[PDB]
Amino acid sequence: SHAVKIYDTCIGCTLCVRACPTDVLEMVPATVNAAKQVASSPRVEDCVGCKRCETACPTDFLSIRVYLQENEETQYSLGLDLADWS
Amino acid sequence: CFSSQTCQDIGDYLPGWTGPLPPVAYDFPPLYPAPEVPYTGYQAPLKLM
Amino acid sequence: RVPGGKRTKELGLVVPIPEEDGLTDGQIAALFVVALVVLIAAVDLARSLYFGLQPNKFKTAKGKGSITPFMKRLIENGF
Amino acid sequence: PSDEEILAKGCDIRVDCTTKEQQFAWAKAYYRKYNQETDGKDPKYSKPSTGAGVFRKFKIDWPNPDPSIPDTTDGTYPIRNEDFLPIWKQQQEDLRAKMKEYIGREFTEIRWIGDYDNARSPYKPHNGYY
Amino acid sequence: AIFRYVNATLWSKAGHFNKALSKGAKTTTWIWNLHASAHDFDIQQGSAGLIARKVFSSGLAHLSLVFFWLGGMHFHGAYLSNYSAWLKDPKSVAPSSHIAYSLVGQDILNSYTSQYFSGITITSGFFQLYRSEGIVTQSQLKYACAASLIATLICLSGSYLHMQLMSKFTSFYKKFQSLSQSHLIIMFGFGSVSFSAHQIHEALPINSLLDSGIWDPQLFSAILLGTPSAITGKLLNPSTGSIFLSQVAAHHLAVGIVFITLGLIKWCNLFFSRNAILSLRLAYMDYHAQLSINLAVWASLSMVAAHHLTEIPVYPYESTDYPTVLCLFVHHACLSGFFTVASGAHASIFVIRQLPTSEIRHRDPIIGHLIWVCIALGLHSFGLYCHNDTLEALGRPEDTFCDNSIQLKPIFAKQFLGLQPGIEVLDGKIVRMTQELGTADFMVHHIHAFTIHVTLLILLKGVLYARNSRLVSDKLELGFAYPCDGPGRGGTCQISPWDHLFLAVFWMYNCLSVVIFHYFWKMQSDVWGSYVHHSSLTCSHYSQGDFSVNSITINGWLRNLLWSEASQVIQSYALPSICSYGFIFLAAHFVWAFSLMFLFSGRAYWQELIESILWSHHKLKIVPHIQPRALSISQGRAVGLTHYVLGGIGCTWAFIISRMLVLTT
């Protein structure tokens, strides 16, 4: 699976969460920024690696980073449809 | 009439045909008489012949 | 030969062929014996490379390990 | 001398054949003896099949053959509709004579850049309308 | 109707049409997007009425452009051409309405065409077209040019007017029944009848006089006079080597009558199976659906034109004008391919913007079987060539697929003309000759089928998987032209219908290049050439009939067609006639190679290089406020594709035209 990390530069605009195609991310309460919320990545097992969160991130450099891990590819991260590894 | 049979003539293709026009035994006469003696700027009607 | 080279045809270059093969069956057999020894050693080496180092050996293997005095001197000298 | 004795003596730079001319003479003798100009491939594979007038030899289209392709295998193509050419020449000559008589004067070559008055124009001719 | 709203104020805004370009010129990507979306009237600011306005007015403006081009052609023929010399003696003088300057030694390009004329030999067949039309005077050509210019002005005025005449209530463009009926009865039926009238009344007497040899002004200013009872096409004009123009006029009269009859039966509702097409009628009332259908129709008609303009001779002396016939075939084949890939593109756009038809719901079997047929066709067809190569190299011709060896006879390729035995000749040239099909024709035709099927596979996959797929389920949300969906799910590169076209264009170009090479080599080897003397002639062909013996191997194609026949273009530098063709050969090679830059590289390298370069500009205080950017991914693909196709087409163009020009002169 890929690694989706969030950094404190986050401003809690929720655009990453809204752009998530498989609902990997969710906003959580925080005090670091004025919006009082920061995106989290609890369901990183479903991350496919499309980097749409990264596309939608406003900050100067991304407060959300998706690191691709081709060696640890799973069926959920590969979006397998015709074949099942479960 | 296309591949096994080599039809050389229009008569072969369509029975009873021998030329560009259909084989009608009617000679189409002129609907109106023509001037025996012409005049400058006449442009007599063309003939399909 | 049916040469296809312009220079070969022009200069009459030839590929001379011997009347008898250079090596005999016994010589080829000896070379193949050496090659077989190489192959056995190479299979052993490939197995060793595949399995890598075994740090568990100190638990069961015979002996108490040994470092050559020159290796000890190198270690003391350092890098 | 001759290739047989040249090859019998043989060439060896180390001992006697220190002469490049002798070396290449022996090489030429060996070449003539052991090399062939061509592999000897059958000439048939080089001959054309289509467009050379020898198509019928191969029997490629035997079932319901195409009439337009000549049956002769000599490699020559007859001219299609030969009989019409004399007829066409006669028709065109007859039409030429007919139009010559109809006009009443010799045909005059048209000018690409020239200007001609219309035969029915009401004004006096400037350039002959023909 | 209100023309007070057309002002030049918007001319300097440069991006008003697209709302996404409101933040003008923050980067060079803005310039590129402006150009890319200039003519995408659907996504532009306004309404559906405005979209229709723009579509119709742009069609009229392009009509005016084409009329201007035709008028320029007529003017060049009239004033900058040797049409007079060609008309009096077509064989001796090559057509040339093209003259070059003497700027830098550039006068070398002009070549001997006549005693008093030097220029560039044209290959469009315009001289033959004029001769068929009966145009034999500079005055006639000048008035044709004047008519074309007047039509250009009229079309320009019509576009400008219709930009405001049509309002939001305008609906005449949605009256498909009226549109089709009018086009079928008037534009096609009445048009064909009127052109038959024109032929009968103007071209037939002039052409008959020209065939006879009469050049008298009074004569230039009795149908079926010379045509025998022989079937049309079975007997060519002995003095011109083309179908009788009276037969052509009768054809046009019959075609116009048939079109009028079809329109009238449709008007009377005689056609009954409306329900079988009602689904398409409801679904495909869209701009892009109609554009795709029309593009495919015109592509197929262009291919049929390419085949017929050569196989069936109708223009005077075009049969013996070998460069003309070759160039016409190649040009129309290329247009066929381009318009077919265009039809695929706009089918994909229609699927994206509108609801698709129900054949998309079993798309997996369709594309799966197409994939299988493509694989099997390619394997067999190309592996026969590879087998021939390998076996011939090994020295076993008896094991290869050829007429002498194992032979693959095209049993289904059967005659239908029923022509008489022999060939038709005209002044030392073979105007018409039957093409004899064998193993080489079988193999090349199956190669053609393979390439066509692979191009169709790419286009159909793009069309059917445009809305969604197993990989990505929101491709509809992504749109039509996007680079990817991300590196995820393994990587979603080129999943868009735009990229499917970007690949189908490569495959169409490959198919058309093979088709061009097949036509060129087959015609040179087995059809074209001269003859040496009931009489029997031995026909000396330009390529010496080597297609049937050498085309069976890829090495034969490489040697006897590319290398052997590139002697003219490769050795064209000293020759005044074709030095330009040699230089264009070289430059097209350069451009094709230069395209690989964009086809292989990626955006990020160039963006980083641009930033490193911009460091120095900033250091020296050269600050471009339209910040430089690397070309987008889709733009890089488009640029690479354009340069690739242009370079390949230019190489083929120069090679074939140089060969033909040298051989015929």
Ligand code: CLA
């Ligand atoms: C200044 C350059 C120039 C100009 C202005 C023209 C103008 C014209 N040529 Mg062309 N021509 C040129 C150079 C030029 N030519 C050269 C260098 C040659 C080689 C000798 C020719 C050979 C030639 C022939 C043989 C003919 C013409 C014709 C024409 C007319 C066609 C209308 C037209 O272009 O539509 C616009 C068309 C296009 C934009 C075509 C685009 C796609 C082409 C076909 C792709 C082919 C490859 C391409 C040429 C090179 C790619 C590589 C390159 C980037 C390095 C027009 C008068 C025809 C005619 O009827 O003339 C009266 C004609 O028969 N020309």
Ligand code: CLA
């Ligand atoms: C794989 C697909 C394919 C394609 C795209 C083409 C394309 C072409 N073939 Mg055909 N051809 C095919 C297969 C194909 N062929 C096969 C398998 C054979 C048998 C070896 C032939 C034998 C053949 C000959 C002898 C000739 C052509 C020719 C042609 C041309 C069309 C005109 C014609 O006569 O077609 C005829 C098409 C056929 C005879 C094939 C029929 C369609 C398929 C095979 C039906 C199979 C369906 C079946 C019910 C179920 C199969 C189930 C599966 C699990 C096994 C064109 C280049 C002609 C040509 O122009 O040659 C120069 C020609 O002379 N083909």
Ligand SMILES: CC1=C(C#C/C(C)=C/C=C/C(C)=C/C=C/C=C(C)/C=C/C=C(C)/C=C/[C@@]23O[C@]2(C)C[C@@H](O)CC3(C)C)C(C)(C)C[C@H](O)C1
């Ligand atoms: C077992 C046993 C006992 C015993 C015993 C006894 C007496 C055993 C005797 C064994 C004996 C007498 C064994 C000979 C072998 C000969 C060989 C392998 C020769 C190979 C030769 C080779 C491989 C040569 C090959 C070639 O080079 C050649 C020649 C030519 C070259 O062109 C190349 C080649 C490669 C082709 C004890 C001591 C009595 C009691 C104990 O308790 C148990």
Ligand SMILES: CC1=C(/C=C/C(C)=C/C=C/C(C)=C/C=C/C=C(C)/C=C/C=C(C)/C=C/C2=C(C)CCCC2(C)C)C(C)(C)CCC1
């Ligand atoms: C350019 C070009 C081309 C070509 C084109 C063409 C050539 C087309 C056609 C065109 C045409 C050729 C058209 C036609 C038209 C015609 C018409 C449209 C007509 C109409 C008619 C009418 C309208 C009638 C009227 C009338 C009269 C006469 C009077 C009274 C009666 C009536 C009303 C009936 C192509 C495609 C290749 C593309 C490229 C280039």
Ligand SMILES: CC1=C(C/C=C(\C)CCC[C@H](C)CCC[C@H](C)CCCC(C)C)C(=O)c2ccccc2C1=O
């Ligand atoms: C080279 C390259 C670039 C860099 C190329 C750029 C930025 C193009 C430069 C544009 C110039 C400024 C346009 C002006 C036109 C030329 C300078 C004209 C030259 C004409 C000669 C005859 C002199 C990309 O950005 C790129 C992006 C994605 C895939 C591949 C590539 C790619 O291959």
